[PDB]
Amino acid sequence: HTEILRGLRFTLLFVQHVLEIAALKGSASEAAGGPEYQLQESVVADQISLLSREWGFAEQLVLYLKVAELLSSGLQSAIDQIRAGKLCLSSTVKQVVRRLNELYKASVVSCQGLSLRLQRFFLDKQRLLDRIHSITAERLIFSHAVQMVQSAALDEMFQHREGCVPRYHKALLLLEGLQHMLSDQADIENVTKCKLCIERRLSAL
Amino acid sequence: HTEILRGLRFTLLFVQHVLEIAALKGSASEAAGGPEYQLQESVVADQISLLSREWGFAEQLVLYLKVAELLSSGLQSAIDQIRAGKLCLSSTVKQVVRRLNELYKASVVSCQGLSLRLQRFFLDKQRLLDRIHSITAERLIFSHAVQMVQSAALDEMFQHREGCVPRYHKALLLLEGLQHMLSDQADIENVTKCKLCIERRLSAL
Amino acid sequence: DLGTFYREFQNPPQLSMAEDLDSLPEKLAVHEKNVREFDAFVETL
């Protein structure tokens, strides 16, 4: 037990959480208002975050692609070892690993189905689509998730709402896990600060 | 030093000679000289010479001023004079200088009249002379000494052996007053050296 | 307690997208094939 497949399942839960953040990004973000707020956002914020926001949806589809690829990459090692059998083989994480693999299949399907029109989308100002230089599909909605966590914690430290450290962990600790994706990089430790905050906040949770 | 003796009593003769050096003594390049000279163009040469008939006359007036300025005081001193030269009776030696001195009034007269008559024309010359640098035209004495040595050395051949040696001796005698006009620090000494060369030529003449 | 850090966590640190996007289809189909192999192993599993 506690094998490469198990680590892959943990990182796969993290990937699923990040993919859920992405799913909200897929023209589906909502329920961020919480307490009584500037309800006028009904049209204003709607247009602001929807009317021309397909860049985020594309970032989310590419993120789904990245998730499927990462699942395949972890599998090519873990399953190879399991067939080789260097581990204990005392547990049944294999069916769950298969479920994660099917999830990767679905995620890749989503990425391709999106790409069907995202080809012409990227064709719109393709040179502009280029010159991104630094980029990270995770960060694309990680900024949004961190902003949402910030709103929750603004409600929290002033007690305008209640929740748990895990509420932010769903993305911050998601980044904490699978840290190789944030290990040895320019923006390394992508959620280290939120993780440090959640460490203390665990008690209040 | 014979100021009250013969060495200066005869100096009136040298003064008169220097006066003559210009008086009816306007030199020019149109001078023929030598054994002979072609007169086929002598008319135009004299024309070029006399195209400034009064200009040389004015230069002569300026030169004569150099002796006339002292001649005025000599006339002033013609009364109550003191001398002690010997070998004379009834101040005959005094008369030796005073007879020549008796023409000092006419000397001033000529030093004026060599340019005075055409006063209106002299105004234009003065109009020229106003910003024209002055020139003590008496410097032509050095030119006379140079021309004397030059004749004595390089006149056309077949002349006699004496060779106008007395003329160059008189030129050498310029030191008796030809340097009364204005020049540089030692231009008078330079003219005296020219006189020395002319005297050497006279000895050779 | 957590507010001391909440001060620090204000804004998130930052990080040729068209070219990478164009080149992606190879890695995508590669993921598809690795998934097929994974399905093979799972059926074996």
Add this chain to the structure above:
Amino acid sequence: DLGTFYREFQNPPQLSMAEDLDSLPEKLAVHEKNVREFDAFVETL
């Protein structure tokens, strides 16, 4: 020598003027008045 004389000089050339010596009429009249002593000259001396 005559050659030495020409060596000393073969043929060297001749070398605010309205007021540099304009005082001429002054001494001129001075002499015109002074000539009276010689004009008289009752006895030579």
Add this chain to the structure above:
Amino acid sequence: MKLYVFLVNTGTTLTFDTELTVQTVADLKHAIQSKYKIAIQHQVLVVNGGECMAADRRVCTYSAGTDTNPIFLFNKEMILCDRPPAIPKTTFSTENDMEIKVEESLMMPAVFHTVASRTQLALEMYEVAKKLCSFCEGLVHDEHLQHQGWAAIMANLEDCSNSYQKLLFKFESIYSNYLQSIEDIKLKLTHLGTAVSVMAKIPLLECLTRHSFNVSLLDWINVQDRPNDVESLVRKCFDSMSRLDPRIIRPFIAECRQTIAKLDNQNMKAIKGLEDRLYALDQMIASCGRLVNEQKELAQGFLANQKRAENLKDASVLPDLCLSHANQLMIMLQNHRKLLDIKQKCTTAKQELANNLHVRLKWCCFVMLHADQDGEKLQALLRLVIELLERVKIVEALSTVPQMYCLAVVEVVRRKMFIKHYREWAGALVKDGKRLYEAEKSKRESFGKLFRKSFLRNRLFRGLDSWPPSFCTQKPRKFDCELPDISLKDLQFLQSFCPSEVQPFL
């Protein structure tokens, strides 16, 4: 010189070594560790005037404190709750034991030496109580530094109260932030149509995007950075608007009121009143020491007993006088009984003051918790307001940009075209000037060779001696030379095809 802290919050004044004269405040907390948990996380350690410093500071970076100067700690890290250490010193029943010893053990008076020893032993007890009194004086200084720390904390509070007023400024800003929010929504409402204008971005441009289609270069650059949100960031804007709801001000206002109450400080001043009396208590204790010195004189008097015990050569009265001296010293020790009595009484009152101070420090830290937590929270709200301003500003900026950058481009295009026109005109005039300059130079050369053949013209000619200024003849450069690319003209044409903000761009 440098010295250790008073351990003020409880009060355990002590000195330190020479190293601390320049050892940093970090080294200060190190010394705090050196004999205690005093390195722990804590409320504040402070000097006269109130330091509440931090480890980074060098020794001189903070104000001085010494075995005669004020610097100490007043924080929960020692005794987070009331923790009155009791009387370390010995009780005085030995004197009560000595009371018996004088009362009865002075028996067998014929042993004058032993009686004197008892008196000396009584004198021993005297000096002992003297030490006790000194310790009392220590307690006095303890109360001193105690009030000192109380004041230091007070200072902190005022600094917090200063921070409180800073939060108040925020509040005025927050209300202004509430007030400015009145049109900020309209500003966001306008930002809706502004992002609409960003849509249908300049269909062409100088060099299109120039690499630094439906991907609006407006919205594109609106994605030109990693972690921010385009089109006024309204998902965050309404969120912060909630983060600054009137209810927050009300909870914030209540926090402010409590902070004012957190400074009520009624106990502190009232304790001082007692301390003022307790200061007079110190005076009385000083008097106690005075009587102690009196007891010393008694020992000085008692010394005379052992003295006269030797070589007197007189009657038995001297032996009797010691018994009389014994009674005298006994009454002395009775006064001393009252003395040590009031002494320990003072010690008790001292502990009591310490306890009142314990309650004090409790409430003080509570504010230093309740307020200070709320205080930093207010600081956060302040930065949040700064954001509520700056982000809205940027939103309005991009809004104008929907007009601004477009009109700027149109102006640049028209200027570039007319600049080409004017550059052509200026160059043509420059070419004509070069032609005339060549004419002048030709006159110069011709009539100068002629002048080289003129008649002594140096004084005899002028005017054409040179030529008029041919300088500034090389043709001009391009007006608006380095301009962004000409497809801006195509953008100007395309303005109609993207008429979302047509008038302003025109």
Add this chain to the structure above:
Amino acid sequence: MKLYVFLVNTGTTLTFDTELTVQTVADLKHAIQSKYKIAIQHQVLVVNGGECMAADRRVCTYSAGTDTNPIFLFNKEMILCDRPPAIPKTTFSTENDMEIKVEESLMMPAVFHTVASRTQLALEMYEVAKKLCSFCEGLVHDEHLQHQGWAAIMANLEDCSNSYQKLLFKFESIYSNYLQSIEDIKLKLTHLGTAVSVMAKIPLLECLTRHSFNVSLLDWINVQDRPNDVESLVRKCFDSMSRLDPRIIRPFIAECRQTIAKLDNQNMKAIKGLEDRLYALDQMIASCGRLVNEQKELAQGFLANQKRAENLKDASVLPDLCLSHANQLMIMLQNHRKLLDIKQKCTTAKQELANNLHVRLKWCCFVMLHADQDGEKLQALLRLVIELLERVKIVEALSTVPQMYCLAVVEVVRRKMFIKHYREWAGALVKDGKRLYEAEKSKRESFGKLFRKSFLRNRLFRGLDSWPPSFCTQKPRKFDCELPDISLKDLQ
């Protein structure tokens, strides 16, 4: 070391300190003047190919006055003259007058001086005879060195004739160009007055202001120099024409002008028949030396004759006290004078031949003096003729007045007019340009200064980031570019 070689010019020996190289050639004249009466102007001799030397500095620079330099020059101390002596030999006649064994024994028994005789007095006589022979050898050598000097003199004469040829080539011009000058100077004398009149016709008021008022321009030209005449060039040209009379055109006006043609050339230069006779003289000397070397000994063989007499030891040696026993030595006792005279014959012959050589040297020195210091007059005269050609050229500069003044006036006027018009138009155009600069560019600059942060970044609204070039908007300079104070109207 000093030169054992003697002075050829005098054909005699002398001496001086070897460090004389620093002494000047004129200092060399002073040295040869303290005695022998040289002078700073003593002879027509020159250095090298007929020219003067740099005598002022150390004569070593001109290779004169050196330790290896005995006296040699035109040899003016005597006009082909000297005092050639001959060998005195009466001393030998005294020896011949007493040519016998001495009377110190006076016909005593022959044991008297049986190991001594008159050989030494005979030896003294013969050795002195050989001494006179070598003396004649040296004297002949002296005459030969004199011949070498005479050759050097003929060479100097050739160099002089070369200088003469150069001066004649000048004279060719100083004839042909002088003949060409027969027209130029006359015209230079001709039109100069007309030019001076034309110049004085319009003396500019600018010229009146020039020295900073009317004045005579030609005189202003004339008096421009103190000695210059408004027809000085014309006067000098006419004077040169006067000096260009036919007697100057004579083929030997300077008698040298044909003396060099005839004597120093044209088969009259006898130097062609010079050197070989000097060689013939050296041959005569060598033959004399061949005859006279070791000859006194050849006659007086005392060394062997001593033993010869010893072997003789005549039992009747009475007649042997006379020349009969002393044979050829006794012959030498009277022949020494004859040999001395024979040597003196060739010696004085050499001296007289040198006199004849110096005579022909003076014969050429005739045409020499005709050239040196006589035709050199014509030489400087031709230099003057060249100066006269330059004066004619200057006369043309006077002729340059008639068109030069009008050209200067017209060109300056038109140039000032064009300059004024162009500067005014340039200022006006620069003004219109600055007006455009304001109206469009400065307004745009203000709008852009406002446009600070109009977009979140500079490139976002990139465009018209600056104004046009704005060059050429400043004012032009001053018309006519600060000409001289001559006013064109004052010229007008």
